[PDB]
Amino acid sequence: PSTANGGFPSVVVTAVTATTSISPDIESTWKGLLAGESGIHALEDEFVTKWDLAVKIGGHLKDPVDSHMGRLDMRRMSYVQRMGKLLGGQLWESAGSPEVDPDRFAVVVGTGLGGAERIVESYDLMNAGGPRKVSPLAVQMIMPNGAAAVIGLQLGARAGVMTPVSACSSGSEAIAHAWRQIVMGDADVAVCGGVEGPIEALPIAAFSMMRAMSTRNDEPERASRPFDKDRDGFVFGEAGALMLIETEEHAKARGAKPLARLLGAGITSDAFHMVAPAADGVRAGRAMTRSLELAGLSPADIDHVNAHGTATPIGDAAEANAIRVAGCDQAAVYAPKSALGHSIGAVGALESVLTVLTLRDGVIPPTLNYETPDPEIDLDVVAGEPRYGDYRYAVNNSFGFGGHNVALAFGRY
Amino acid sequence: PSTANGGFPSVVVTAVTATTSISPDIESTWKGLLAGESGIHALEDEFVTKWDLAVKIGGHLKDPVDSHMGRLDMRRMSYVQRMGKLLGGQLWESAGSPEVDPDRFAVVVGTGLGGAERIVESYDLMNAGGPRKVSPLAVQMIMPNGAAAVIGLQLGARAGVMTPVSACSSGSEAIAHAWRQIVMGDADVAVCGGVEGPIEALPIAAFSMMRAMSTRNDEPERASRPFDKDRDGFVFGEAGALMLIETEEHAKARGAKPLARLLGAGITSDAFHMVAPAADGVRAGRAMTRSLELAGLSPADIDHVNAHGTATPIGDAAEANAIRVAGCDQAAVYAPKSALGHSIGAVGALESVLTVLTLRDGVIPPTLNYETPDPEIDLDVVAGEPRYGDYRYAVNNSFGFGGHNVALAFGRY
Numbered sequence: 001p002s003t004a005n006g007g008f009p010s011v012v013v014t015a016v017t018a019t020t021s022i023s024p025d026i027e028s029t030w031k032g033l034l035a036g037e038s039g040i041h042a043l044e045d046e047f048v049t050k051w052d053l054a055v056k057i058g059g060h061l062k063d064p065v066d067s068h069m070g071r072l073d074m075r076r077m078s079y080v081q082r083m084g085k086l087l088g089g090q091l092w093e094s095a096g097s098p099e100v101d102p103d104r105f106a107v108v109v110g111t112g113l114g115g116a117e118r119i120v121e122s123y124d125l126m127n128a129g130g131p132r133k134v135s136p137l138a139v140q141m142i143m144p145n146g147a148a149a150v151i152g153l154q155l156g157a158r159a160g161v162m163t164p165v166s167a168c169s170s171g172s173e174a175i176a177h178a179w180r181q182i183v184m185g186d187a188d189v190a191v192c193g194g195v196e197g198p199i200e201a202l203p204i205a206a207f208s209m210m211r212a213m214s215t216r217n218d219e220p221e222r223a224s225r226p227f228d229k230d231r232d233g234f235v236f237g238e239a240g241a242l243m244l245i246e247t248e249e250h251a252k253a254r255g256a257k258p259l260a261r262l263l264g265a266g267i268t269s270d271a272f273h274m275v276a277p278a279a280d281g282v283r284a285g286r287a288m289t290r291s292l293e294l295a296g297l298s299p300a301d302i303d304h305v306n307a308h309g310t311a312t313p314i315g316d317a318a319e320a321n322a323i324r325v326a327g328c329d330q331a332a333v334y335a336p337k338s339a340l341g342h343s344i345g346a347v348g349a350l351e352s353v354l355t356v357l358t359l360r361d362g363v364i365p366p367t368l369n370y371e372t373p374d375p376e377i378d379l380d381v382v383a384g385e386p387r388y389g390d391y392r393y394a395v396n397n398s399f400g401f402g403g404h405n406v407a408l409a410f411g412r413y
Numbered sequence: 414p415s416t417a418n419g420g421f422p423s424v425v426v427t428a429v430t431a432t433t434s435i436s437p438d439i440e441s442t443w444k445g446l447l448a449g450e451s452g453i454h455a456l457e458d459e460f461v462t463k464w465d466l467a468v469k470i471g472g473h474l475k476d477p478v479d480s481h482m483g484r485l486d487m488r489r490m491s492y493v494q495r496m497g498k499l500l501g502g503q504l505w506e507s508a509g510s511p512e513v514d515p516d517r518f519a520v521v522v523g524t525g526l527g528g529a530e531r532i533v534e535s536y537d538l539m540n541a542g543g544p545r546k547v548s549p550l551a552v553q554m555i556m557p558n559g560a561a562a563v564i565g566l567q568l569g570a571r572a573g574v575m576t577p578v579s580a581c582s583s584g585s586e587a588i589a590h591a592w593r594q595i596v597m598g599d600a601d602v603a604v605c606g607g608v609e610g611p612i613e614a615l616p617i618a619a620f621s622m623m624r625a626m627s628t629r630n631d632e633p634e635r636a637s638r639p640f641d642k643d644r645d646g647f648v649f650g651e652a653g654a655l656m657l658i659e660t661e662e663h664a665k666a667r668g669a670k671p672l673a674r675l676l677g678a679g680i681t682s683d684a685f686h687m688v689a690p691a692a693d694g695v696r697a698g699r700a701m702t703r704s705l706e707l708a709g710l711s712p713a714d715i716d717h718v719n720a721h722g723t724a725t726p727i728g729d730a731a732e733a734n735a736i737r738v739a740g741c742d743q744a745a746v747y748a749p750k751s752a753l754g755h756s757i758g759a760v761g762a763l764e765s766v767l768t769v770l771t772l773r774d775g776v777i778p779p780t781l782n783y784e785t786p787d788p789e790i791d792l793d794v795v796a797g798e799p800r801y802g803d804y805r806y807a808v809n810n811s812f813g814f815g816g817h818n819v820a821l822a823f824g825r826y
């Protein structure tokens with residue numbers, strides 16, 4: 001059973017929303033990427049000077065989430081819940097505020113951590129003034145399912161509200177499980193994607209101490225160099241992203257105009273190391289292969305790979321091997337983290353949206369900062385200018401610390 | 414397509430492990446439950462008197478996890494990772510240490526929160542000594558996918574390592590997704606269940622400020638009273654639980670004797686309330702109904718319901734409505750939280766293991782403290798002494814903060 005042979009129902013993407021370091025408007029982010037814009041800047045936050053952080057670069061959201069939040073929302077929600085509410089509302093408006101069957105409507109939203117700032121706040125409040133100073137709302141704000149739960153309540157989804165956690169692949173895994181919920185017949189429509197917290201001193205310290213992060217502070221826009229010989233780790237770029245998926249029949253019935261098809265999803269694991277990806281890229285490649293099996297595609301059908309491409313030395317080398325294992329090494333490769341940086345639990349969802357726009361508009365943006373090819377990579381990296389083409393099929397790659405591999409197969413509508 | 418009509422492959426439970434407030438040995442926990450034992454005691458921890466907490470009762474594990482942890486494991490893992498590794502090794506030994514195909518072997522382990530104590534440790538270390546006092550190991554211990562990742566790495570699972578988070582339903586949802594991973598053909602064998610952190614001062618503060626917890630401190634063993642007129646909220650009872658599931662053909666090939674059949678799983682959502690179940694129990698009932706649809710069973714086939722039964726006023730009232738909506742109100746009901754208390758992200762997995770043992774041994778333990786049945790609830794709650802009966806099919810119910818409903822349909826082997 002496959003999408004191609006009608007074993008699974010046809011599933012279409014009918015709306016997308018994202019907030020990024022370039023714009024709060026996904027169409028403006030898209031136009032900016034195609035024009036070679038970067039969201040990465042010098043961090044002006046006082047915490048950089050306070051701690052003299054080795055990393056002094058990153059992409060804050062162009063439009064901060066809390067500029068849209070009233071006093072009640074600031075008191076009763078964690079940051080990722082506030083981001084979830086904002087994007088959920090925007091997505092539903094973009095979809096024409098459809099009246100769907102709540103009992104056939106699912107939400108699947110991944111995140112890296114959850115309402116972690118409310119853990120440290122509760123800890124500090126209790127140490128200061130005892131247990132009665134902890135908010136009655138602490139549990140519902142902290143719990144990592146909090147963002148999915150807020151969006152489910154907001155939009156009226158009664159066919160399941162789910163939160164997969166797999167670190168940097170959480171946002172893609174959410175879209176994978178939303179696809180599974182529809183093709184298994186539990187839902188006809190799903191809001192899915194990923195949200196993530198902002199750049200702060202403790203997050204920078206934790207990832208910096210792994211030596212995972214770029215310290216090219218003198219030239220912030222040149223720091224994120226996926227697949228480049230001179231890469232030195234990832235750059236934080238804040239983001240959140242949701243898409244609306246539904247059966248082709250459901251979309252047709254309400255006169256929704258599909259952006260793309262979601263054809264298949266592959267989830268595998270390395271069982272190799274807690275943070276290092278498997279050097280051979282075999283299980284990562286097999287995630288890509290599994291997405292093709294469920295789609296009913298061959299590797300020769302794949303015109304485009306949206307790479308995980310974090311710009312770590314070991315990460316990009318492993319992914320180049322994975323793309324070869326999957327037989328997709330003739331595909332045009334884009335690494336959006338070159339321009340938008342790394343949003344951890346959100347980034348797979350953001351890159352899924354970018355993959356949909358590539359197929360909709362028949363264009364791949366340039367991988368920024370790709371100036372010196374690495375002999376170990378040997379990929380067709382899109383660079384210098386956007387690449388226009390009749391792109392029919394694309395795979396979005398997303399890999400997570402812990403050895404989690406998620407590949408999503410998309411088709412042009 | 415159903416288990417009954419052969420649309421899904423037959424999936425069997427071949428091993429179980431759990432650590433509880435009664436015993437570190439699941440077979441000894443089971444004998445203790447049948448003897449009418451409670452794991453709930455007066456908390457003797459210094460932190461109770463230090464903070465003068467409103468809740469002074471709970472079930473610590475009979476055998477603490479860290480009594481089995483050497484210095485290396487204490488330094489490189491969060492608590493839920495240490496619990497995960499301990500149970501992972503115990504389960505594999507119980508299964509006869511099988512040599513399986515790593516590329517057909519999945520891990521799905523739920524948890525409520527993750528390595529949260531390492532967030533507050535990292536925060537304290539940075540505030541005291543700056544960013545270079547944060548461990549290179551912090552991210553991999555903190556990340557909520559950490560416990561599943563540790564078990565995947567320990568046992569060599571390369572067909573996916575997944576962590577669903579849905580608060581009190583996480584452990585059941587993990588078993589649901591493991592069943593999905595097998596019936597969709599991604600894996601032939603899966604380790605699945607739930608782990609959760611210990612009873613500490615901040616957890617008691619956060620949950621007790623929700624006003625959801627029993628304050629019957631003078632009679633700890635009498636505090637947890639699911640479906641009783643005098644119930645006054647839930648009691649913490651520490652646990653972790655894993656089961657090994659595989660296709661019946663995979664079990665037969667290696668000569669594994671199944672303990673039970675896992676027939677189907679239903680996941681729905683309320684989209685009503687953030688911390689309480691919907692009073693009408695309709696979506697919770699639909700999760701039970703969905704599990705029966707996928708199993709290919711009718712409500713009349715269900716001999717036993719292992720209730721969520723948290724002993725909150727609203728929880729037990731809503732669940733009584735859910736069981737009636739699902740047509741299962743003639744089933745024999747057990748509320749194990751009466752004896753073992755509430756282990757949040759682990760409890761759905763623990764109660765799934767108890768459902769398996771009920772079917773294997775044809776016996777339901779007594780629901781403790783069921784002395785004045787609630788006049789507004791009419792369920793067949795097993796109480797007094799264990800009920801020996803011809804239990805062919807059972808549903809395990811789990812509900813989670815955020816409006817999550819998970820039902821698992823099990824069959825006698």
Ligand SMILES: CCCCS(=O)(=O)Nc1ccc2[nH]ncc2c1
Nearest residue numbers: 116117197198199203238343344
């Ligand atoms: C793109 C930057 C991401 C940093 S993260 O991975 O640490 N996520 C995160 C989650 C919750 C948070 N609350 N407050 C800060 C914060 C950061």
Ligand SMILES: CCCCS(=O)(=O)Nc1ccc2[nH]ncc2c1
Nearest residue numbers: 530610611612616650651756757
């Ligand atoms: C049955 C007791 C559950 C309490 S919890 O839900 O708060 N879980 C939890 C998770 C991580 C933790 N790290 N340190 C303490 C701790 C507790």
Ligand code: NA
Nearest residue numbers: 306307308351
């Ligand atoms: Na990608």
Ligand code: NA
Nearest residue numbers: 719720721764
């Ligand atoms: Na139960």
